[PDB]
Amino acid sequence: PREAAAHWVPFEDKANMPDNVPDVVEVGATSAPLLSASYFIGAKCKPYNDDFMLCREESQGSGAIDCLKEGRRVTRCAVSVIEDINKSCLDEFRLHWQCLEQNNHQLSGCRKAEALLNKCVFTKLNLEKKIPGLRPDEEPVFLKKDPWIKPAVDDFKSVRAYAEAKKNGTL
Amino acid sequence: TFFHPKSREDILNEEAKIVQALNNQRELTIKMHELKREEKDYAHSYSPLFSDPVPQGGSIGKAPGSSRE
């Protein structure tokens, strides 16, 4: 779909869902927290996302109205994993997504906070971040040490926390 | 004694053979005319290899559900 052109007004619809449709909770995180949590959401909810997309394909055009149920499933899985992060690893999650807010949302600028967040989530939620499609020879960039590309300013709080973790031995 | 025409039966046979060849040509003629107006397969008339008429569009933003048969 194309973006809007010369003159447009945004308009809001005040109707409710039809009551036959089961209600569902909506994901409340914004762009930076969502981008921070994306890899864990994928790792956990991959089967449900795949099922949702397969339903949308097989519906062959009526996807919006035939694929509501596993859409509810997808949103519920996403909300569950975000809640788990909010319960178990909140401080590192905030480090990561505030760092992203500062660095134009480039994951390359938040490797230090991302290491802490990844360790916390692996230990307390058993989710691993992994980049699909790479051969064993190719190395995931977020695991690479001494990258060519570095942020302008290493985030202050993230640097302090990373050095602290290096002392504690958690990282 | 000097008149040696061909026999009547031989003349009739030869003309009948000629007319038969002419009718064969008429039938081949009408045949080709009908066959040219019959419709060919997509492979024979458009593309032997890649014989599927159904397109597949662009592949960048491939959206689940855009495929319709």
Distance CA(B44)–CA(A157), nearest Å, equals: 70
DSSP 8-state class, residue B5: P
Distance CA A41, CA A47 (A): 11
- Per the CB < 8 A criterion, the answer to whether B33 and A25 are in contact is no
Q: Residues A87-102, buried b or exposed e (16+ Cβ, 10 A)? A: eebeebbbbbbbbbbb
- How far off is chain B from A104, nearest CA to CA, in Å? 24
Considering only CB atoms, which chain A residues are within 8 Å of B67? 57, 60
Q: Which three-class secondary structure state does DSSP give residue A98?
A: helix
Q: How was this structure determined?
A: cryo-EM
Residue B53 and residue B42 in contact, taking contact as beta carbons nearer than 8 Å: yes
Give the residue from chain A lying closest to B68, CA to CA. Answer: A60
Distances (CA, A) of B52 to A40, A60, B66: 41, 19, 18
**In angstroms, what CA-CA distances link A143 with A7, A98, A165, A169?**
47, 21, 17, 18
Contacts for B64 with CB less than 8 Å, ≥ 6 apart: A53, A54, A56, A57, A63
Which one-letter amino acid corresponds to residue A115? A
- Cα separation, A36 vs A112, in Å, equals 13
**Residue A1 belongs to domain spanning:** 1-171
The count of other CB atoms within 10 Å of the CB of residue A77 is 18
Would you say the C-alpha torsion B29, B30, B33, B35 has a positive or negative sign?
negative
Radius of gyration of chain A (CA): 20
CB A59 within 8 A of CB A67: yes
CA A149 centroid distance within chain:
22
Taking alpha carbons only, the member of A147, A86, A82, A144 closest to residue A115 is A144
Q: Of the candidates A51, A43, A39, which has an alpha carbon nearest to the alpha carbon of residue A100?
A: A39
Helices (H), chain A: 31-59, 63-66, 69-88, 90-102, 111-125, 156-168
Q: How many domains does chain B have?
A: 1
Q: Please state, in angstroms and as integers, the Cα–Cα distance from residue A26 to each residue in A56, A72, A78, A106, B4, following that order.
A: 20, 9, 9, 26, 114
Kindly report the backbone phi and psi dihedral angles of residue A102, in degrees, each rounded to the nearest multiple of 5, phi listed first: -80, -25
Q: How far is CA A145 from CA A58, A115, B7, B54, in A?
A: 44, 12, 111, 49
Q: Which domain holds residue B9?
A: 1-69
What's the total number of domains in chain A? 1
Q: Phi and psi (nearest 5°) for A144?
A: -75, 140
Q: Which of A82, A105, A86 is nearest to A35 (CA)?
A: A105
B chain contacts of residue A56, beta-carbon cutoff 8 Å: 64-65
User: In this complex, do A61 and B68 lie within 8 Å of one another by their Cβ atoms?
Assistant: yes
Query: Interior CA angle at A24 toward A85 and A88, to 5°?
Result: 10
